Design a protein around this nucleic acid. Structure first.
Lengths: 76, 51
RNA sequence: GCUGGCGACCAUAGCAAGAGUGAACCACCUGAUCCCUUCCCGAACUCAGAAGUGAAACCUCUUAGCGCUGAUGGUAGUGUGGGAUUACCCAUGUGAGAGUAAGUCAUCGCCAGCU
RNA sequence: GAUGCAGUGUACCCGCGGCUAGACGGAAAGACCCCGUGAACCUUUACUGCAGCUUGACACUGAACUUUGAGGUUCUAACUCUGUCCCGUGAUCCGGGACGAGGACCGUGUCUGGUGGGUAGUUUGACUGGGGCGGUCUCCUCCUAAAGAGUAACGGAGGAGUACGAAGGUGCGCUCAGCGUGGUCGGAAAUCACGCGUAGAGUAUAAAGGCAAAAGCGCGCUUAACUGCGAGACCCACAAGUCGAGCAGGUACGAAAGUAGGUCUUAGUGAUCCGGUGGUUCUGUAUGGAAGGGCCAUCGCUCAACGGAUAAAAGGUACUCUGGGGAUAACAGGCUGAUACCGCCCAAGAGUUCAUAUCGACGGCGGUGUUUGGCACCUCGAUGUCGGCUCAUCUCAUCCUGGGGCUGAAGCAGGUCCCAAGGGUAUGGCUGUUCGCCAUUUAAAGAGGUACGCGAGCUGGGUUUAGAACGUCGUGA
RNA sequence: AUAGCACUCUGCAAACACGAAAGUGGACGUAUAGGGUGUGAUGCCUGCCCGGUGCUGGAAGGUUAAUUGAUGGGGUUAGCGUAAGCGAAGCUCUUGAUCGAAGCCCCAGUAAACGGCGGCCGGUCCUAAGGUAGCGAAAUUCCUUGUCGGG
RNA sequence: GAACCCACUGUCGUUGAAAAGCCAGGGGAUGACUUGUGGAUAGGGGUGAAAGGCUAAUCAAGCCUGGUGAUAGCUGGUUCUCCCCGAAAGCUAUUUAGGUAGCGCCUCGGACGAAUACCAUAGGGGGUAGAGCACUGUUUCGGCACCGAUGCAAACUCCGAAUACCUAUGAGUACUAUCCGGGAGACAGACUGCGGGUGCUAACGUCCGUAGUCAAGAG
RNA sequence: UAUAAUGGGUCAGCGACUUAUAUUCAGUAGCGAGGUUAACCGUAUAGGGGAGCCGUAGAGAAAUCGAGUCUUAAUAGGGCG
């Protein structure tokens, strides 16, 4: 008899809106367990590290800063 | 484990909150300021049996 | 042409070693009266000041020393069609990683002082 | 596992007497095995009723004297006699009468506690390389998972069924770990001071994704671990789950711009029904109230078989039965060849010396389809056998006889290898045996395939129905 | 099954059985009789255990039913109150003190009652107690075609 | 030891002379014996020197008639013709696993037309193949845990494709997409190639992803 | 599945999606902001019979309001119309 045989339910993480798409305020952009992407301009962060848009515009990804962090922002 | 308790408004409105508590580390009755929607003011709430 | 502040950028821009700067600015610097301060200490924070020094520190300059960047060519992998089954071959499209030649001791913007 | 398909060989048309190798021959919707939220009967400390037995209270049920509500003594008139006598009456039933022995007891009705396989109705999960035994059943993290999401196995590894009034909020402030020098006990390693390189420390707890405006570590003040909501999205069969700017009211911390709707995040959970507690400008069976119901808030689940059949449930059947399945096991066939058997390559060495006369370690490569196995493709509206008897047919990896090479072959014998399938190739004791051991023979008493050849050719000793007994297991069947 | 043996129940309107009852069998019998249970002529015999379940005998201690209904709390209205509210009696909803048997808990006996007669390396642990006579590879022995003797 | 009552062995018989027998042998045969006539016991009952035996060729609960056309998630069967379209054997839950329910896939009617798809161009995130040793582990040889060489990894990563996937614009081709309603079936799949787990890099083996064929398709 | 998986020896005759009620959808006809009767009476498929049913208004648990209503301190926001 094996001592294995368990696993957890899926969580459906990942990027929901890619670069170049238009969003409205409140749209969820990234679902993530940790902070792989950071919040840029017009982007807010939830209590579970979810990134969402706070204004209408176009999504844009970039790499910025002295630590080389990945940022996502919304251009109005 | 942790026991359940009610915090009852001292204004006499009957409003209450519910929470848990460690009886060993907290033998005394709990008292804390909270909002009371019945009178729309902050007042002191005191511990009581949850029954 | 120097000094200070605030940004763009985040190593071709960083570390390391060596050398300079006191007019102004900055830095150490004097003591602790009042404001304020240390689970103790005017060491840090703070106040009241210029008798000393550019020693340290911060800036500027030089060096390829460490680091970082990095081709061209080839190789591995791979979508579609065909031929084979120890995982290859042909046609067509695509194309790394590592390594080699080589490069680098940054580049810009706003304001205020001194020549 | 083919009379009927492909290739090929053979074969003029039709009877009669025999024979049983095949037509998976005929016969009985398999009885073995599994399944169905099928059946019957049996057992018990399975669940739940009832009969029977038993306890007390009330009624039938009365009187007179005593003692510390109860107990005692006495009586007769209720009531009992399957005791005697008389009458109906010609009668061991029955009724009436007279006696006698008992007597408010016994017994019966209603209510009530106990006991209750005597009897009755039922329950006793699923997954599963057949079923049983074992393990598992809900949630979180990683891999499998093929660079969006999702993705199975009785695949490989680990965790959860909590904790905290601060370990929450805010303002201000601070950086770990390691090594090296010195410095009392003090050292491998307690604390102190100074250096070197450096995230390897820490984050209540498993792993992963993260963490300098530190999300890590301290101090002061505090309760936003608030009320009413909520544009817009993620995920999704449903029921559920997740993120959220912003608006109003009341707060906390900051000089202020501001931050705060619990904790770095992802586990720490349970629908509906039925009840309990607080509040309420709801309802209220003629009317006024009330009881009860509604609405808002909250409490009672290892319902863990975790979408939870009931408030309440275990076993046996060889005494068995029905509906089904070759969807699924035991025999034989099939695929495979781990295992089994046979052959070959290399060669440490053994063989007085000499690897190869004969053996040959450590390793390597194949063949066959006689073994033990793996799978579940055929057959469950039946393919019905362990051994013996009778009768066979084929293979060659040859037991004897025939022909040869080498030899550590003097001769006689022997060893090893090559060619060769024409013929031949024991009787008994023991046991159901196949096998094996033993006795005595023979030139020899070979190894295998043929549904482990052959039971519509024979037998029926073994296994495997119903009877009975022993050992052992069970309370028992 | 049996003759024989043992245990146990039954005092007569017997125990027991059939039947809803009336009644009937037991029996026109009476403990040398009748029912139930086990063993199985005869010979020699029949060891230990009462912790468990059962049965028998005690106890009046604890627990407990129907019945009973002391207290306490509500609903309603005469009235008293500016109002809020208070509010007897009478009806009614509920709460439930006290009394209360058998059984069970407790204490003994009983195995020809149902049952049991050990472990781990002489010792030790544990039991209610650890197998007496007799027999033994047996209708019981897996290993096993045990070993030896006879045929 | 005859009659009479039984039923131990064997042959035959087995669509029999016979729905239990014949033949040759066998046991008891004054007793707990055999037998005629007439009576009693009735179905959860009877009777049983006890085999679950017997109770009219029927017994782990007789036969007959009623409830009754019991129920059966199971097996079988389902009858004339032509035209059009055309599946699935998956996910989730289930005392559920060969049943069923919601969704996915089919068909018919209505609404509404480019909102759809193929391809080109542009924008975008990734951590697989490959590779590497910078972390975590593991490996060989030297020098003194470090230093120089040297290998390996599903649960290692300083790196890192091709394809797939999301969005916007656009030519050409095509009854495309979407919404609202009526009716379903199906929830046992198989093989082959490619990427894998398990198994022995066995199986016409088993479990997933992806494409083709069969299923439902002849030549 | 030629299957060595099931069923049928052959012929003739018989043999299996019905009936009643309720409800929803689609066709078709009458009337149309309206439509329609049931039991019953009736020498009776006529004619009477308007009780009742469907449509015409939602929101809210409900009392209550009503083109609005519920939640709320809110005329804010939001849900159903």
């Amino acid at each position: 008899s094996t001592k294995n045989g368990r696993d957890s339910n899926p969580k459906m993480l990942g990027v929901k809106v890619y670069g170049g798409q238009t969003v409205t305020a409140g749209n969820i952009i990234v679902r993530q367990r940790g902070t792989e992407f950071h919040a840029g301009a017009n982007v807010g962060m939830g209590r579970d590290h979810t990134l969402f848009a706070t204004a209408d515009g176009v999504v844009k990804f970039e790499v910025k800063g002295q630590f080389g962090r990945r940022y996502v922002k919304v251009e109005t | 484990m942790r026991d359940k308790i009610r915090l009852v408004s001292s204004a006499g409105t009957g409003y209450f909150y519910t929470t848990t508590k460690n009886k060993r580390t907290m033998p005394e009755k709990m008292e804390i300021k909270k909002f009371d929607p019945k009178i729309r003011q902050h007042v002191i709430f005191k511990e009581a049996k949850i029954k």
